[PDB]
Motif scaffolding. Structure first.
Motif, short mmCIF file in Angstrom:
data_model
loop_
_atom_site.label_atom_id
_atom_site.label_comp_id
_atom_site.label_asym_id
_atom_site.label_seq_id
_atom_site.Cartn_x
_atom_site.Cartn_y
_atom_site.Cartn_z
N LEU A 86 1.02 -1.20 0.08
CA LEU A 86 0.15 -0.08 -0.07
C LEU A 86 0.77 1.09 -0.01
O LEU A 86 1.96 1.24 0.56
N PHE A 87 0.46 2.28 -0.81
CA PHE A 87 1.04 3.45 -0.76
C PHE A 87 0.16 4.55 -0.75
O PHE A 87 -0.73 4.63 -1.54
N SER A 88 0.45 5.91 -0.20
CA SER A 88 -0.47 6.94 -0.24
C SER A 88 0.31 8.22 -0.74
O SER A 88 1.39 8.24 -0.28
N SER A 89 -0.67 9.19 -1.30
CA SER A 89 -0.10 10.35 -1.60
C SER A 89 -1.49 11.58 -1.34
O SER A 89 -2.49 11.05 -1.43
N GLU A 90 -1.14 12.52 -1.36
CA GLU A 90 -2.16 13.67 -1.02
C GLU A 90 -2.12 14.82 -1.68
O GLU A 90 -1.21 14.96 -2.48
N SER A 91 -3.23 15.53 -1.73
CA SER A 91 -3.06 16.89 -2.51
C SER A 91 -4.22 17.69 -1.69
O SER A 91 -4.73 17.41 -0.55
N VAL A 92 -3.91 19.10 -1.94
CA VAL A 92 -4.91 20.06 -1.31
C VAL A 92 -5.53 20.92 -2.38
O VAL A 92 -4.81 21.20 -3.45
N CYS A 93 -6.64 21.70 -2.01
CA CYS A 93 -7.21 22.63 -2.77
C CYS A 93 -6.26 23.96 -2.88
O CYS A 93 -5.49 24.25 -2.15
N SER A 94 -6.71 24.63 -3.97
CA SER A 94 -6.31 26.09 -4.32
C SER A 94 -6.41 26.99 -3.00
O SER A 94 -5.56 27.74 -2.77
N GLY A 95 -7.47 26.67 -2.28
CA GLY A 95 -7.84 27.40 -1.02
C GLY A 95 -7.19 27.15 0.15
O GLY A 95 -7.50 27.73 1.20
N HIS A 96 -6.37 25.89 0.24
CA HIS A 96 -5.86 25.52 1.42
C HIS A 96 -4.63 26.78 1.70
O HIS A 96 -3.99 27.18 0.93
N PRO A 97 -4.45 27.01 3.12
CA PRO A 97 -3.76 28.11 3.35
C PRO A 97 -2.39 28.31 3.00
O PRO A 97 -1.93 29.11 2.45
N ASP A 98 -1.77 27.01 2.87
CA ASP A 98 -0.45 26.88 2.33
C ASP A 98 -0.22 27.11 0.74
O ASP A 98 0.59 27.98 0.17
N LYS A 99 -1.40 26.34 0.28
CA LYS A 99 -1.35 26.85 -1.22
C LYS A 99 -1.83 28.39 -1.82
O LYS A 99 -1.20 28.55 -2.72
N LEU A 100 -2.73 28.72 -0.75
CA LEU A 100 -2.85 30.15 -1.07
C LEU A 100 -1.63 31.04 -1.11
O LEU A 100 -1.31 31.87 -2.16
N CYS A 101 -0.58 30.82 -0.23
CA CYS A 101 0.45 31.52 -0.13
C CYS A 101 1.46 31.44 -1.44
O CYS A 101 1.88 32.37 -1.96
N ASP A 102 1.55 29.97 -1.82
CA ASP A 102 2.12 29.52 -2.91
C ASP A 102 1.86 30.41 -4.12
O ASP A 102 2.52 30.88 -5.02
N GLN A 103 0.33 30.52 -4.36
CA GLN A 103 -0.13 31.21 -5.32
C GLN A 103 0.02 32.66 -5.37
O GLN A 103 0.43 33.39 -6.43
N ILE A 104 -0.13 33.23 -4.09
CA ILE A 104 0.54 34.66 -4.08
C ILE A 104 1.87 34.95 -4.55
O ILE A 104 2.12 35.88 -5.03
N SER A 105 2.76 33.89 -3.97
CA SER A 105 4.23 34.20 -4.19
C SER A 105 4.42 34.22 -5.60
O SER A 105 5.07 34.94 -6.25
N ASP A 106 3.75 33.16 -6.33
CA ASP A 106 3.86 33.18 -7.67
C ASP A 106 3.24 34.14 -8.49
O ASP A 106 3.68 34.62 -9.70
N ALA A 107 1.91 34.82 -8.10
CA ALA A 107 1.28 35.79 -8.77
C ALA A 107 2.42 37.07 -8.58
O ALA A 107 2.45 37.85 -9.58
N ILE A 108 2.85 37.20 -7.40
CA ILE A 108 3.94 38.21 -7.40
C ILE A 108 5.18 38.08 -8.32
O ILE A 108 5.61 39.22 -9.16
#
Ligand SMILES: C[S@@+](CC[C@H](N)C(=O)[O-])C[C@H]1O[C@@H](n2cnc3c(N)ncnc32)[C@H](O)[C@@H]1O
Ligand SMILES: C[S@@+](CC[C@H](N)C(=O)[O-])C[C@H]1O[C@@H](n2cnc3c(N)ncnc32)[C@H](O)[C@@H]1O
Ligand SMILES: [Mg+2]
Ligand SMILES: [Mg+2]
Ligand SMILES: [Mg+2]
Ligand SMILES: [Mg+2]
Lengths: 386, 386
Positions: free
Chosen positions: A4-26
């Motif tokens: 068995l092996f697991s991986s995850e993902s998060v939505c665009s609105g996840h607070p960490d991903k929100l920060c990634d998006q702002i950083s890349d927008a800049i």
């Protein structure tokens, strides 16, 4: 032998991903005006505020605060009850110029081809013939689930969906068989999804919606069975979300951004960094290499490691591992020779070849940097190797 | 078949590591008064400021600002020219209580043994017989270099060392041979060290000092040869450092904290988190498992993956890979059975067994969380398995 092996993902609105998006927008805002910009833009967030901080040396005239607000607006954070409101939040900007001592060993008095790496570090690339994207199935499935939720919420659908709020996460466990290093998925063992919602939709309704309109749309029916464990909103209530429930920072989703636990990771974040930061550009080129080797039929799975030293153009080391899956006649020594005839890991060459001074980065900052079809992600367009 | 592989480490004064240390100082401060504290303490820094932010629910009465200042003082940041001055910096505290919706699925109305995981996610543990610590040699060497610099600077020596400033990084590349999955180091291929310094020590002096008092003290002489590439302060000047040159954030050194690129990583940060955050506790138990399997002589190298879902006590999956190095009679299926008879990955059990409500965490936040001899890191005390 199964495992068995697991991986995850998060939505665009996840607070960490929100920060990634702002950083890349800049980053994109700087690059669209000044392709030569040096950008190291970190973002963090908690209830009612965003702070951008770090080092930018640019000729661009960017209204950083407006960029932050527009990015948050686009993600859907337009009300305090959703977890953040772009209209009301405090935005703090604490940017300085890049250190001249760093600049001095990167570009000053150097030929463009021989610019120094922006830092030391190691980067990995990975590819596997499990999926059409040449990505691990666990990652592809978890990412597809969150990408589908984001599409349903943001682009919109004809059905009642205004109950869906921006935050959310998913995790997929696959049962595999391994033959000679080749990974053959057998079945999906567990699917976990947590989605933020408002106060009037039933848990039973959320569960039916996610199962029918998300899970069954993106997970192959022939890998799901009666024993597949479906866990949708196990906490039983997820109405408070976003920065209101959990602090976010740039570069805290590095495994979601890459391969979901497969392959390896050198530790560096991608978002907010211009391409002289080899954390990003080195990883993108390493992906192209791995993907090209697998696409070319030379192996079934491939891991690449490159490493750099600050101010030094050429990589300090390069490594290829095909997990014993190399095609007859090939091996890892021969494959490294092939890679060296074709590719050049000097950042100046990397940057030119992958068009990394163009404002292409906001698109990478949600949905994973790899296994993507967008025409502009040149690191996903494989080279035929023999 | 030979190959090259690199790992890195950073000094205690590296801005990201500084944030990890502050976050864990705050965690320990809460735990020493209130072992039941829920802590999710993020830190960030740039020139002249530190911000602590996140969620803490505690009965402790902690002067957060004094904890931050004392931590920075202990690291040696006592002057603006070093990169930060604990006396003059702004300290901003933006803490709120833990979300009740998260608390409700972790501990509320649950038996201590059956508390829910604080989040979803995956965690890996790894061990290898390369070193006495059962850690990869590349990681051990890079970490030893930065740990030695920190010791020289902080504890102090009889020689003139006041020129050494707090920031710094190292990277070590080892050439290996691989026999049946077993990793045999052949030689050290490259050693890179960048150390922050003041304005009066010569580059030649820095290089002689690092080579003789650091590299030759911690790297085995029989792995170094005339072709080993020694790169000490390649940028040629590194006087501006710390937050003054580079922003820091908690949880941006996750690979330095773990295995240096070897094994795998599930993506979660350790520092600033209480043990109900399975990112930390799950990884610590996974390390104990891997280390116990290798220590017991049952294989030469071992990777463990565990995964969790929020509010759910038992793990969603468990995985063991011995890279084909299992002892005669053993295999990964049998080893998983052995692990299940001995270990219990429920967080409530994990926490009890590893004493994770005691204020032990500041020590983990520099120097790597694994391969450590300190008596209190119970995840490093292997169990004999058969
Ligand atoms: C569990 S929180 C992280 C731990 C948190 N900082 C704390 O104080 O315990 C991580 C993520 O889980 C998700 N989350 C938040 N509230 C949740 C809820 N009520 N149910 C399920 N997931 C939730 C959000 O995506 C959030 O960013
Ligand atoms: C190179 S910086 C990161 C990139 C940086 N944010 C920028 O604006 O380009 C990362 C780390 O490198 C180290 N560093 C800073 N100045 C340096 C110098 N002059 N020479 C070598 N390493 C340096 C410090 O440990 C610092 O935290
Ligand atoms: Mg996070
Ligand atoms: Mg780095
Ligand atoms: Mg950093
Ligand atoms: Mg996580």
């Amino acid at each position: 032998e199964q495992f068995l092996f697991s991986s995850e993902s998060v939505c665009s609105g996840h607070p960490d991903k929100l920060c990634d998006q702002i950083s890349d927008a800049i980053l994109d805002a700087c690059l669209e005006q000044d392709p030569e910009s040096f950008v190291a833009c970190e973002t963090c967030t908690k209830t009612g505020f965003i702070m951008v901080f770090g080092e930018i040396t640019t000729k661009a005239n960017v209204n950083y605060e407006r960029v932050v607000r527009e990015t948050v607006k686009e993600i859907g954070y337009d009300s305090e009850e959703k977890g953040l409101d772009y209209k009301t939040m405090d935005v703090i900007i604490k940017l300085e110029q890049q250190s001249n001592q760093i600049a001095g060993c990167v570009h000053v008095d150097k030929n463009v081809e021989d610019i120094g790496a922006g830092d030391q570090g190691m980067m990995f690339g990975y590819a596997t013939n499990e999926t059409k994207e040449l990505m691990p199935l666990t990652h592809v499935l978890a990412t597809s689930i969150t990408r589908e939720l984001d599409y349903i919420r943001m682009k919109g659908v004809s059905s009642r969906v205004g109950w869906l709020r921006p935050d959310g996460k998913a995790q997929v466990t696959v049962e595999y068989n391994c033959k000679h290093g080749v990974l053959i998925p057998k079945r999906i063992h567990t699917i976990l999804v947590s989605v933020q919602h408002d106060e009037n939709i039933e848990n039973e309704e959320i569960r039916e919606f996610v199962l029918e309109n998300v899970i069954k749309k993106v997970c192959p029916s022939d890998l799901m069975d009666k024993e597949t464990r479906i866990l949708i909103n196990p906490s039983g209530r997820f109405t408070i979300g976003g920065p209101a429930a959990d602090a976010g920072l740039t570069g805290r989703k590095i495994i979601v951004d890459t391969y979901g636990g497969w392959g390896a990771h050198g530790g560096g974040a991608f978002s907010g960094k211009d391409a002289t930061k080899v954390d990003r550009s080195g990883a993108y080129m390493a992906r192209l290499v791995a993907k090209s080797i697998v696409f070319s039929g030379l192996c079934s799975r491939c891991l690449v490691q490159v490493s750099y030293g600050i101010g030094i153009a050429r990589p300090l080391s390069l490594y290829i591992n095909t997990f014993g899956t190399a095609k007859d006649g090939y091996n890892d020594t021969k494959l490294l020779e092939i890679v060296n005839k074709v590719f050049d890991f000097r950042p100046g060459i990397l940057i030119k070849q992958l068009n990394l001074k163009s404002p292409i980065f906001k698109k990478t900052s949600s949905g994973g940097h790899f296994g993507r079809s967008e025409k502009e992600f040149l690191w996903e367009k494989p080279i035929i190797l023999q």
